[PDB]
Amino acid sequence: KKTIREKAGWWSNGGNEKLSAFYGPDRGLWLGPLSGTTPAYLTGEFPGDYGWDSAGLSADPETFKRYRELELIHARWAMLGALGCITPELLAKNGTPIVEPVWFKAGAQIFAEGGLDYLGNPGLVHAQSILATLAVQVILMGAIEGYRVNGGPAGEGLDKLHPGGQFFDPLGLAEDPDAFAELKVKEIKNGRLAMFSMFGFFVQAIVTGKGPLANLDEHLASPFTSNAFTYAQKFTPQ
Amino acid sequence: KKAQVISPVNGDPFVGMLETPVTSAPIVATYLSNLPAYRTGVAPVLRGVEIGLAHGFLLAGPFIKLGPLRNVPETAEIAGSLSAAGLVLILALCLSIYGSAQFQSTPSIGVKTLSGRSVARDPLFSADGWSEFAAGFLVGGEAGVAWAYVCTQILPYYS
Amino acid sequence: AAQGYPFVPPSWAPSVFVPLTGLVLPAIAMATLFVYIEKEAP
Amino acid sequence: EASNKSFPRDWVKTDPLVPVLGFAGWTIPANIGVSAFGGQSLFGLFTQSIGENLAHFPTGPALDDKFWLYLITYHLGLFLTITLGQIGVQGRKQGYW
Amino acid sequence: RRTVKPASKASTPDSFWYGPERPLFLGAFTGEPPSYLTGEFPGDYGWDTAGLSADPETFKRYRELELIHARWAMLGALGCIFPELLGSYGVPFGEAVWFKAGAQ
Amino acid sequence: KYGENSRYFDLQDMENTTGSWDMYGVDEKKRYPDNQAKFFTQATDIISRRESLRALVALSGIAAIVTYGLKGAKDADLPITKGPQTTGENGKGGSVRSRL
Numbered sequence A: 001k002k003t004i005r006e007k008a009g010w011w012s013n014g015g016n017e018k019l020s021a022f023y024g025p026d027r028g029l030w031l032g033p034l035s036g037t038t039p040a041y042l043t044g045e046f047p048g049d050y051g052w053d054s055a056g057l058s059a060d061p062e063t064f065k066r067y068r069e070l071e072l073i074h075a076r077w078a079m080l081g082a083l084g085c086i087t088p089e090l091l092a093k094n095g096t097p098i099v100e101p102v103w104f105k106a107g108a109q110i111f112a113e114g115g116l117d118y119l120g121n122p123g124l125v126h127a128q129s130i131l132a133t134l135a136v137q138v139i140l141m142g143a144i145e146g147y148r149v150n151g152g153p154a155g156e157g158l159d160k161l162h163p164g165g166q167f168f169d170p171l172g173l174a175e176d177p178d179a180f181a182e183l184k185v186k187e188i189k190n191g192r193l194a195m196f197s198m199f200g201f202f203v204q205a206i207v208t209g210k211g212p213l214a215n216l217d218e219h220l221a222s223p224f225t226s227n228a229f230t231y232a233q234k235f236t237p238q
Numbered sequence B: 001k002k003a004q005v006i007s008p009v010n011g012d013p014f015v016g017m018l019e020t021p022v023t024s025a026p027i028v029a030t031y032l033s034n035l036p037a038y039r040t041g042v043a044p045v046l047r048g049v050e051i052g053l054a055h056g057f058l059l060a061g062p063f064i065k066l067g068p069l070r071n072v073p074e075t076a077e078i079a080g081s082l083s084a085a086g087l088v089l090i091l092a093l094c095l096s097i098y099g100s101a102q103f104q105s106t107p108s109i110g111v112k113t114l115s116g117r118s119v120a121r122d123p124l125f126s127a128d129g130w131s132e133f134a135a136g137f138l139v140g141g142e143a144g145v146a147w148a149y150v151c152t153q154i155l156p157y158y159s
Numbered sequence C: 001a002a003q004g005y006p007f008v009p010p011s012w013a014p015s016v017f018v019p020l021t022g023l024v025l026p027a028i029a030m031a032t033l034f035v036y037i038e039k040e041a042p
Numbered sequence D: 001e002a003s004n005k006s007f008p009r010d011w012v013k014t015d016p017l018v019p020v021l022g023f024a025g026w027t028i029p030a031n032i033g034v035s036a037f038g039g040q041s042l043f044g045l046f047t048q049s050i051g052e053n054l055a056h057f058p059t060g061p062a063l064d065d066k067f068w069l070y071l072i073t074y075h076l077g078l079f080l081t082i083t084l085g086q087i088g089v090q091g092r093k094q095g096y097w
Numbered sequence E: 001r002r003t004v005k006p007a008s009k010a011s012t013p014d015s016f017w018y019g020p021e022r023p024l025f026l027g028a029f030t031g032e033p034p035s036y037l038t039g040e041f042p043g044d045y046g047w048d049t050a051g052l053s054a055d056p057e058t059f060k061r062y063r064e065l066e067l068i069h070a071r072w073a074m075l076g077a078l079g080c081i082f083p084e085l086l087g088s089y090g091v092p093f094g095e096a097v098w099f100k101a102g103a104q
Numbered sequence F: 001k002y003g004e005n006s007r008y009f010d011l012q013d014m015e016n017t018t019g020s021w022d023m024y025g026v027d028e029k030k031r032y033p034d035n036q037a038k039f040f041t042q043a044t045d046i047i048s049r050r051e052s053l054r055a056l057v058a059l060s061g062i063a064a065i066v067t068y069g070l071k072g073a074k075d076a077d078l079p080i081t082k083g084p085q086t087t088g089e090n091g092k093g094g095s096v097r098s099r100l
């Protein structure tokens, strides 16, 4: 019905049927063609709506709103965390002299008497007091999150999840409402992937005990040799 | 003894072009119509980008393989790519000054398509159109010279 | 120059001024004296 | 030229039988073995040289290869046969005799 | 370059392989094909000398069989030629020849 | 009209009369991917005027010749930058008078 170059995905700014796979009735669902009866409250109006409420926890619209905000905030924090749990180890295996690049050991760097050099450079942050660090952090993050929940110096009458003034959308990527609608989906999908992968970081720490990039490397060395089933008998009750 | 091939241009025996296989063979007409020079509805900057990519990529070869540093192993390709970059820059300059010299009189006669339907003039043949065409030619030509070097470096069977 | 006579050109002067005088100033000149030749009068 | 108002697209009055018939009229006599080739044929020796030079594909044939003689003679006869077949067919259909 | 005009004037000047004036399997020696092979279907050279597809529905089922066999046979020809062709170049198959490749 | 009965002159069609034809032009708007076209319409946005393009060309060419004379000719290992590497044709003025 179309020509070759429209099939091949040319001609940007033809997007109103491309939101159909992420919003609306006939969108992609959590079990795909094997998920018939989506919850009636998951109408397809919000980003990331795949019809997954098996436990019915979001049946109330207001708790659904609160859960959406929880999801997006967790997603953003988990994206930052997934990037930050791999950046030091990547940089250390590329050769930056980070003293403890593994993430679940990265907090114990501040107890070495050379302090917490940021990239392993003593001329950088050079933090020694974990208590002063925590105090600074508590003050700043309390101000920050209280500003988030009602408003602050960066806009008060803005949305609770996507404020998008000149402080939180300073590149203007989301001025087109369709670009905004699909970027919301990209945000929530990358964020759900990051939350799953951060759960994976947690479990791979508690189970394996090495770094996540070290786990990737020892899996790529001999995958069938070394897997999560290698550590299946680790939590044996003795 | 029928079926003569060579015809007057659009049937006009007094305009003086003599349509001919090399001129109006459907394969030839198709190929020449599909060239960015004759895509009169497309923006001149993009046609210039395509033309410049092509020409910058092609005119690096001579400078690489036949230049004065052609017999130095790793220096031949660099020197040729830079010579081609300079030639592309000169050509962009020439294109710019041509756009300054040519488009001042604004011809008044319309155009047709050898079929009868009058089309709009190519925006390329204006001051703004030719300026953006020359900008596109410069960008595309430097990009194509850089890509010629990249192909010297990454193509498997480059001698 | 140090003390012999001031305003002596540097050693790199020819390498810069021969290209300038032969590739650039002729380019500038021919471009300018091409726009001026083809310039229509109002 | 009172005719020819638009350069007819079918300027070559194509008959797909013409190339096949010229090819067969040349290559079949070109597959007849003769005394001068040592019992071999022109097409046979030409294909033999094609094989001998495809055995080192990048390295092209030499000046002293004899592949060029077979090539040029075979294609002389073949192009001549094909063009004369086209001419004859389109003269038979049209006038010209 | 000229714009080719639509097919209201030119509905079937290109229908060389369909219609009554279509090529047949004996050329000029075919005479006239059977009354059911009328040239609406592809590859109809009028070859039904056994009359096996005299019924229209049997003719439809045979067209299905022929086209599916044709696609499978094209895939099969390419698949028997390709491994042997690349085995003549130095790709070390177990048995590049097709009627021995199954026992690999 | 203009093609009717060898009437190759029309005052109401001076385009066909004078032979003002686009022999190969096509006015189809669709040639390039829109993201690519956007990329290249924005890459040339700064130099899409005559003055800006000539400023770029002047800057690039002057910088290029200056860095070629200062650095690029020596990087190319040009004989004029290496020097004679010999005593040259110094003492051999003429065949008769060997002048310095």
Ligand SMILES: CC1=C[C@H](O)CC(C)(C)[C@H]1/C=C/C(C)=C/C=C/C(C)=C/C=C/C=C(C)/C=C/C=C(C)/C=C/C1=C(C)C[C@H](O)CC1(C)C
Residues within 6 Å of the ligand: A052, A053, A054, A055, A056, A057, A074, A075, A077, A078, A079, A080, A081, A082, A083, A084, A085, A102, A103, A104, A106, A107, A194, A195, A196, A198, A199
């Ligand atoms: C949907 C549904 C449906 C039905 O109905 C029901 C149910 C089932 C319930 C549901 C589901 C859900 C889910 C699955 C969830 C999940 C979550 C997660 C995973 C999260 C994470 C989450 C995650 C997260 C936040 C993360 C974060 C992170 C971070 C901060 C980080 C930090 C850090 C880092 C950087 C590193 C350093 O050195 C240290 C630290 C400090 C460590």
Ligand SMILES: CC1=C[C@H](O)CC(C)(C)[C@H]1/C=C/C(C)=C/C=C/C(C)=C/C=C/C=C(C)/C=C/C=C(C)/C=C/C1=C(C)C[C@H](O)CC1(C)C
Residues within 6 Å of the ligand: E047, E048, E049, E050, E051, E052, E069, E070, E072, E073, E074, E075, E076, E077, E078, E079, E080, E097, E098, E099, E101, E102
């Ligand atoms: C038309 C007509 C008419 C009249 O009426 C009657 C008559 C005569 C009867 C008719 C005729 C008919 C005919 C002739 C038929 C034929 C058929 C055939 C031949 C088939 C094949 C057919 C064929 C085919 C399918 C083929 C296929 C193939 C394939 C799958 C392949 C596979 C494979 C390969 C790749 C190789 C490997 O290693 C193995 C294997 C596994 C082996």
Ligand SMILES: CC1=C(/C=C/C(C)=C/C=C/C(C)=C/C=C/C=C(C)/C=C/C=C(C)/C=C/C2=C(C)CCCC2(C)C)C(C)(C)CCC1
Residues within 6 Å of the ligand: D021, D022, D024, D025, D026, D029, D030, D031, D032, D033, D034, D041, D042, D043, D077, D081, D089, D092
């Ligand atoms: C070199 C050689 C030789 C010789 C050769 C030659 C001499 C060749 C020739 C060739 C030729 C000389 C060929 C020709 C051909 C011809 C043909 C092939 C014809 C045909 C005809 C036809 C086919 C017809 C048809 C028709 C008709 C009847 C009518 C109308 C229609 C038409 C079309 C159908 C030798 C033996 C010593 C040996 C070695 C090699």
